[PDB]
Amino acid sequence: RIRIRLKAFDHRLIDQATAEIVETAKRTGAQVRGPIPLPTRKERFTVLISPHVNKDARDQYEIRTHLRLVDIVEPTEKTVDALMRLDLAAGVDVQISL
Amino acid sequence: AKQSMKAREVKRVALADKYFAKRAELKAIISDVNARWNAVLKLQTLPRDSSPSRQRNRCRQTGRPHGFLRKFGLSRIKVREAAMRGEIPGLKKASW
Amino acid sequence: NQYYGTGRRKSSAARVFIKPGNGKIVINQRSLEQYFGRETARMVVRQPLELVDMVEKLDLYITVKGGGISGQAGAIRHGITRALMEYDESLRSELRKAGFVTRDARQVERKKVGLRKARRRPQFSKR
Amino acid sequence: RSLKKGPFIDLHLLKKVEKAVESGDKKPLRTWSRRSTIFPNMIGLTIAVHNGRQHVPVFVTDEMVGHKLGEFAPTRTYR
Amino acid sequence: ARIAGINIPDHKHAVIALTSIYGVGKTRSKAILAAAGIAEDVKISELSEGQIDTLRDEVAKFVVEGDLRREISMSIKRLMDLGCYRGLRHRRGLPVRGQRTKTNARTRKGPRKP
Amino acid sequence: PRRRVIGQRKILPDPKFGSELLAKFVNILMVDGKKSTAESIVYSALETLAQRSGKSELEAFEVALENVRPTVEVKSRRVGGSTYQVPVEVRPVRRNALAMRWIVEAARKRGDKSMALRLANELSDAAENKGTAVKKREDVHRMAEANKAFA
RNA sequence: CCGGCCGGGAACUCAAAGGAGACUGCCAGUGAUAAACUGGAGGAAGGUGGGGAUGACGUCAAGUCAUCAUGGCCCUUACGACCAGGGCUACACACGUGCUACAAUGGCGCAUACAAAGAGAAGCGACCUCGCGAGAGCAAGCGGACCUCAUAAAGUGCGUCGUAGUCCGGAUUGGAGUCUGCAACUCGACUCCAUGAAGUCGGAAUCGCUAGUAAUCGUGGAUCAGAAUGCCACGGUGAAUAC
């Protein structure tokens, strides 16, 4: 119970952020269904590269958005309580559903 | 880059929230078909300009109305100017 | 028991899993007729079954996702050919030799900036 | 043609309308705006609608109640 | 064996007979077909009275014939005293479209004689 | 168009007949990528030609193909300002394709209400060199017999 | 009752991190023994696997002192401040790009099947009812495989206009509305009619196009007080002439 969701755009950063928390709960937890890939967002933002006519000249910009889930089933309350106040993810927010 | 233009836009967006969200609410309360009478038509003291729907919300860097972008609140040229400088996370060149 | 088959073709994949039983094909818990199968590619689904013996070897449940009809037929054919090789490679030699395992990578090309379609540009301007 | 319920009249145009009703229809009201929608009691009072540079007087009758006030002020020009 | 008043509009399809009736163009035939769904193959000449009554109901509800003529006359009069110059644009037979009026823009108006 | 090669390409046949010739006929009879109706009209035409001819359908088909068969042609080069053409025996694949397209165009030369009826009637009366495309074959033959004066 | 809820599993497309796969391997031929060009266990991928970004010094006195910092300078009760109605939607000129048209495959009704792939909180709004309609009100659940468009059209057979201005072709002016800002008047776009004019495949023609490609059907984004013939991206059915 009490799953943890992360919304990041760097595959290595999200990989390490989900590979730290899972053993943070596994210090004294157990079970855990396992890592899940989760779907991703995709948006193609185009903008006129030239400031004067010639619409054909453009460029393609995109932003990634990865998601990671752990789905712990039966952990101990100690480690899930210890999850808070130990936040180290800088510039990226974590999503938790009560 | 008209500074009187930018002053008008700044003051209208400043008055786009303090003078709004309550006059429109009053109208919506009195806009019901059940009797609406001449009160709603006689309560037209609003300039009808401070409403955000009828307000451009121009770009606030060099005052170019063209290419207004909701995602960044900028114009195309300055998006190129700043994004290429980095400092905007998550933005990489797109290909597929 | 099951036979290994996924059948990727033209954005269509069909889980061909064959069990002992009748040679009838059940598509979406339904037969081909009341599935309204007299549409395009009405006979191509039995071409792979036309040459090989039916007897009592094939009974399969199939789900197909993606594509139109040629996509569906290609998915069926690729999945059944992938499930077919349980009988050693003796069959697969002629299966390839006859083009029965043909997988074509002729997917859609992306739309290009400046051209309103895959390869059509604006009609050339005045001289 | 189009539109919905709730005919409107400008508060300033309402002031002018009251002036024409009480003081009399001496001359057509040079209505600077065109936003006002005609009420049936207007029939008999002439007003002038500003199409952008001149206030065009309106043709008032009893049978175009369901007609827009701005129509009677033509906008386009003919040689 | 009859529709509306006394006449002989027979020897044609139901939709053809409808569009042949003045007061019903092809657009009114489209409206009738959308509202009811009567088949287009049936022949008006010597058909069962039930479908005849159905077509009568389809055609009688909305404005046709003499009502159409009086409404065209009223529209012409109102266009004469409309108050908008586009009223005279339509009344003069000039194309209200505003496209090229130099030549052959009066095709819908009709004949021209010396 | 000058560096490429020819791979002798082949596309989907009709499984009932399973012939490359009938495959090419049905695949050139295709328009805008239409499969159900096109093949339906093809089979309608085949059954109607068998019914009207009375003989075996496939041998009647072969007899029709033999009837429409042309022999020779030339190519326009514009060498000396006058018709200066070397009569070249056209490729058997190209000759077959041209005969196919002449049959298809002869079918196309009408504007009849029903495509099935028009196709059946014209191909059936062209099966015995008395229909529509045989006039085109004779015209092409008349285009020959005179281009050999210059070689 | 077609509750994947159990014990769930790998043979599951799917859902993202990483490793292999192809490099002309090795033989035979044409080849100076050089590089290259012809086949075979590979063609599930063979000859840069197919597509995208990556555009060398430079020619164009080209758009940008109206985006911007000025170079030499300048308007100066400001060459500004404002409030309402008005210009880019219009219109007696030639041109171009784009859209349904020339039918019998289009308006016909019915037992009526499979789309990848997005936007979603000045937002998406499953309970009922009716509207020739735009939709009209209680409208749940929601920053997400939760709650809106998967119903895909592409078809089986009933028959039609079974030949023409035709049941094809639906460019007009006024009669009642959907959300409009305060209200639709060169002036919001959409339904119901009176409306189907000209056109029976096209002047001396040019252009784009060598395999999912030219065409034929169906979806998201920008305004969003509001609708897309188009513009930026998608899934279908798929035609050879390269001596």
CSV table of C-alpha atoms (C1' of nucleotides) in Angstrom, one decimal, chain G:
chain,number,residue,atom,x,y,z
G,1,C,C1',-25.0,-12.8,-16.2
G,2,C,C1',-18.5,-13.7,-20.0
G,3,G,C1',-17.1,-10.3,-12.0
G,4,G,C1',-9.0,-11.7,-14.5
G,5,C,C1',-11.4,-11.3,-7.8
G,6,C,C1',-8.6,-15.7,-6.4
G,7,G,C1',-3.0,-19.1,-6.9
G,8,G,C1',-2.0,-16.4,-11.0
G,9,G,C1',1.4,-17.0,-15.1
G,10,A,C1',4.4,-16.9,-19.6
G,11,A,C1',3.5,-18.3,-25.2
G,12,C,C1',1.1,-12.7,-24.7
G,13,U,C1',1.3,-7.2,-29.0
G,14,C,C1',1.3,-3.6,-24.9
G,15,A,C1',3.7,-0.8,-21.0
G,16,A,C1',10.9,1.5,-20.5
G,17,A,C1',16.3,0.4,-18.9
G,18,G,C1',20.0,-2.4,-21.0
G,19,G,C1',22.6,-6.5,-24.7
G,20,A,C1',23.0,-8.8,-29.3
G,21,G,C1',21.6,-8.4,-35.1
G,22,A,C1',24.8,-7.1,-40.8
G,23,C,C1',30.4,-6.0,-40.9
G,24,U,C1',30.5,-7.7,-48.2
G,25,G,C1',31.4,-13.6,-43.0
G,26,C,C1',33.7,-17.3,-46.3
G,27,C,C1',33.7,-19.6,-50.6
G,28,A,C1',32.8,-19.4,-56.7
G,29,G,C1',32.8,-15.8,-61.0
G,30,U,C1',34.0,-11.0,-63.7
G,31,G,C1',38.1,-8.9,-62.4
G,32,A,C1',46.2,-7.0,-63.0
G,33,U,C1',47.1,-10.5,-57.6
G,34,A,C1',44.2,-3.4,-56.6
G,35,A,C1',39.2,-1.4,-55.3
G,36,A,C1',34.6,-2.8,-56.9
G,37,C,C1',30.2,-5.7,-59.6
G,38,U,C1',27.3,-11.1,-59.6
G,39,G,C1',24.8,-16.1,-55.3
G,40,G,C1',24.5,-19.4,-51.3
G,41,A,C1',22.5,-21.7,-44.5
G,42,G,C1',20.7,-14.6,-43.6
G,43,G,C1',16.8,-11.9,-46.7
G,44,A,C1',12.5,-12.7,-39.5
G,45,A,C1',17.1,-7.3,-41.9
G,46,G,C1',22.5,-7.5,-47.7
G,47,G,C1',25.0,-4.7,-50.0
G,48,U,C1',24.8,3.6,-46.6
G,49,G,C1',18.0,-2.0,-43.8
G,50,G,C1',14.1,2.4,-44.9
G,51,G,C1',12.9,7.4,-42.9
G,52,G,C1',14.3,12.3,-39.7
G,53,A,C1',18.2,16.4,-37.3
G,54,U,C1',23.1,17.3,-38.7
G,55,G,C1',23.1,22.7,-44.7
G,56,A,C1',31.8,23.6,-45.7
G,57,C,C1',34.6,29.1,-47.8
G,58,G,C1',31.0,32.0,-50.2
G,59,U,C1',26.9,34.9,-54.6
G,60,C,C1',22.4,37.5,-53.7
G,61,A,C1',23.6,46.0,-51.6
G,62,A,C1',17.3,40.5,-49.6
G,63,G,C1',13.4,41.3,-44.2
G,64,U,C1',15.0,43.1,-39.4
G,65,C,C1',18.2,51.3,-36.1
G,66,A,C1',9.8,48.6,-36.2
G,67,U,C1',12.0,43.4,-31.9
G,68,C,C1',16.7,44.8,-30.3
G,69,A,C1',22.1,48.2,-28.6
G,70,U,C1',21.7,54.2,-32.1
G,71,G,C1',26.3,55.9,-36.2
G,72,G,C1',25.0,61.0,-37.9
G,73,C,C1',20.7,62.9,-36.5
G,74,C,C1',15.3,63.8,-35.5
G,75,C,C1',9.2,64.8,-34.0
G,76,U,C1',8.5,68.4,-29.5
G,77,U,C1',0.4,72.0,-26.2
G,78,A,C1',3.8,65.9,-27.9
G,79,C,C1',4.5,62.4,-35.0
G,80,G,C1',0.9,61.1,-27.9
G,81,A,C1',-3.2,60.4,-24.1
G,82,C,C1',-8.0,58.7,-24.6
G,83,C,C1',-14.0,56.8,-24.9
G,84,A,C1',-17.6,54.6,-28.4
G,85,G,C1',-18.9,53.2,-33.9
G,86,G,C1',-16.3,51.6,-37.7
G,87,G,C1',-10.7,48.3,-42.2
G,88,C,C1',-9.0,43.9,-43.8
G,89,U,C1',-15.0,38.8,-43.6
G,90,A,C1',-15.4,43.5,-47.6
G,91,C,C1',-15.3,44.7,-53.9
G,92,A,C1',-17.4,46.6,-61.6
G,93,C,C1',-9.8,44.5,-62.4
G,94,A,C1',-6.1,40.5,-64.4
G,95,C,C1',-3.3,35.9,-61.2
G,96,G,C1',-2.3,31.8,-57.9
G,97,U,C1',-2.9,28.3,-54.2
G,98,G,C1',-7.1,25.2,-51.7
G,99,C,C1',-12.8,22.5,-51.7
G,100,U,C1',-17.5,19.4,-52.6
G,101,A,C1',-18.9,18.8,-58.8
G,102,C,C1',-19.8,16.1,-64.3
G,103,A,C1',-23.3,10.8,-61.6
G,104,A,C1',-25.6,5.4,-61.4
G,105,U,C1',-19.5,3.8,-56.1
G,106,G,C1',-24.1,10.4,-54.4
G,107,G,C1',-28.9,12.1,-51.1
G,108,C,C1',-31.7,5.9,-49.5
G,109,G,C1',-33.0,2.6,-44.2
G,110,C,C1',-31.8,-1.9,-42.1
G,111,A,C1',-29.1,-7.7,-38.9
G,112,U,C1',-24.8,-3.3,-39.2
G,113,A,C1',-17.1,-5.0,-37.6
G,114,C,C1',-11.2,-3.7,-36.6
G,115,A,C1',-7.5,2.7,-36.1
G,116,A,C1',-3.0,3.8,-34.2
G,117,A,C1',-2.7,8.1,-31.7
G,118,G,C1',-3.8,13.5,-28.5
G,119,A,C1',-5.8,17.1,-25.9
G,120,G,C1',-8.0,17.3,-20.8
G,121,A,C1',-9.2,22.8,-14.1
G,122,A,C1',-11.5,31.0,-17.2
G,123,G,C1',-11.7,22.5,-17.9
G,124,C,C1',-13.3,17.8,-19.4
G,125,G,C1',-19.4,17.5,-17.4
G,126,A,C1',-21.7,8.6,-18.1
G,127,C,C1',-28.3,9.1,-14.4
G,128,C,C1',-33.7,11.3,-17.4
G,129,U,C1',-36.5,13.9,-21.4
G,130,C,C1',-37.2,16.0,-26.1
G,131,G,C1',-35.7,18.2,-30.1
G,132,C,C1',-37.1,19.0,-38.7
G,133,G,C1',-31.7,21.8,-34.6
G,134,A,C1',-27.7,24.2,-33.3
G,135,G,C1',-28.5,21.5,-28.3
G,136,A,C1',-31.7,22.4,-24.1
G,137,G,C1',-31.2,21.7,-17.4
G,138,C,C1',-30.3,18.6,-12.5
G,139,A,C1',-23.8,16.1,-15.0
G,140,A,C1',-21.2,12.0,-11.4
G,141,G,C1',-15.4,11.2,-11.4
G,142,C,C1',-10.9,13.6,-12.5
G,143,G,C1',-3.9,16.7,-13.2
G,144,G,C1',-4.5,10.2,-14.5
G,145,A,C1',-4.6,2.9,-18.6
G,146,C,C1',-9.8,6.1,-13.6
G,147,C,C1',-14.4,10.5,-16.0
G,148,U,C1',-15.6,12.6,-22.9
G,149,C,C1',-14.1,10.8,-29.7
G,150,A,C1',-13.3,3.8,-31.2
G,151,U,C1',-18.7,4.3,-32.9
G,152,A,C1',-13.7,3.7,-37.5
G,153,A,C1',-15.8,4.8,-43.4
G,154,A,C1',-14.0,1.2,-46.4
G,155,G,C1',-19.5,-4.3,-46.9
G,156,U,C1',-22.9,-8.9,-47.6
G,157,G,C1',-28.8,-7.9,-50.1
G,158,C,C1',-32.9,-5.7,-50.9
G,159,G,C1',-34.0,-1.1,-55.6
G,160,U,C1',-34.1,3.2,-57.3
G,161,C,C1',-32.6,8.7,-60.8
G,162,G,C1',-31.6,2.1,-65.4
G,163,U,C1',-29.3,8.2,-69.2
G,164,A,C1',-29.2,14.0,-68.0
G,165,G,C1',-29.3,18.8,-66.3
G,166,U,C1',-30.8,13.6,-64.0
G,167,C,C1',-33.7,11.9,-57.0
G,168,C,C1',-26.4,14.3,-59.7
G,169,G,C1',-25.0,18.5,-58.7
G,170,G,C1',-27.3,21.5,-51.9
G,171,A,C1',-23.1,29.4,-54.9
G,172,U,C1',-28.6,32.5,-53.0
G,173,U,C1',-32.3,36.5,-49.9
G,174,G,C1',-36.0,36.3,-45.4
G,175,G,C1',-38.9,33.7,-42.0
G,176,A,C1',-37.7,30.2,-35.1
G,177,G,C1',-32.6,29.0,-32.1
G,178,U,C1',-26.9,26.9,-29.8
G,179,C,C1',-22.6,29.4,-26.6
G,180,U,C1',-21.4,35.0,-27.8
G,181,G,C1',-18.6,39.8,-25.2
G,182,C,C1',-22.2,44.6,-23.4
G,183,A,C1',-24.9,43.4,-27.7
G,184,A,C1',-23.6,40.1,-34.1
G,185,C,C1',-25.4,45.9,-37.9
G,186,U,C1',-18.9,45.4,-44.6
G,187,C,C1',-19.4,41.6,-39.1
G,188,G,C1',-19.5,35.1,-34.8
G,189,A,C1',-20.1,30.0,-37.2
G,190,C,C1',-23.6,26.4,-37.2
G,191,U,C1',-29.7,23.9,-38.0
G,192,C,C1',-35.5,23.7,-41.1
G,193,C,C1',-37.3,25.5,-45.7
G,194,A,C1',-38.8,28.8,-50.4
G,195,U,C1',-32.8,27.6,-53.6
G,196,G,C1',-30.2,24.1,-57.1
G,197,A,C1',-27.9,28.1,-60.8
G,198,A,C1',-23.4,26.9,-64.3
G,199,G,C1',-21.4,22.0,-65.3
G,200,U,C1',-22.4,15.3,-69.5
G,201,C,C1',-14.4,14.8,-67.4
G,202,G,C1',-12.4,20.0,-70.3
G,203,G,C1',-8.4,26.0,-75.5
G,204,A,C1',-2.5,25.8,-77.9
G,205,A,C1',-1.0,22.6,-71.1
G,206,U,C1',2.2,22.7,-67.1
G,207,C,C1',3.5,21.0,-62.7
G,208,G,C1',4.2,16.8,-58.1
G,209,C,C1',5.3,11.9,-58.1
G,210,U,C1',10.2,5.3,-59.4
G,211,A,C1',7.1,1.3,-53.1
G,212,G,C1',2.7,1.8,-48.3
G,213,U,C1',5.1,5.6,-52.3
G,214,A,C1',0.8,9.6,-56.6
G,215,A,C1',-4.5,8.9,-55.1
G,216,U,C1',-9.1,7.0,-52.5
G,217,C,C1',-11.5,7.2,-46.6
G,218,G,C1',-11.5,8.2,-41.4
G,219,U,C1',-8.7,11.2,-36.4
G,220,G,C1',-5.7,15.3,-32.7
G,221,G,C1',-3.2,20.9,-32.2
G,222,A,C1',-3.2,26.8,-32.6
G,223,U,C1',-7.2,30.5,-31.5
G,224,C,C1',-10.6,28.5,-27.7
G,225,A,C1',-16.0,34.6,-25.8
G,226,G,C1',-16.7,30.6,-31.0
G,227,A,C1',-16.5,27.4,-35.8
G,228,A,C1',-11.3,25.0,-40.4
G,229,U,C1',-11.8,24.4,-47.6
G,230,G,C1',-6.6,25.4,-45.0
G,231,C,C1',-2.0,25.1,-41.9
G,232,C,C1',1.3,21.4,-37.9
G,233,A,C1',0.9,15.8,-36.9
G,234,C,C1',-2.0,10.6,-37.5
G,235,G,C1',-4.4,5.0,-38.8
G,236,G,C1',-6.9,2.5,-43.3
G,237,U,C1',-7.4,0.4,-49.3
G,238,G,C1',-3.7,0.5,-52.4
G,239,A,C1',-1.9,1.4,-59.4
G,240,A,C1',3.8,0.6,-64.1
G,241,U,C1',5.8,2.1,-68.3
G,242,A,C1',13.2,2.9,-65.0
G,243,C,C1',15.2,0.0,-73.6
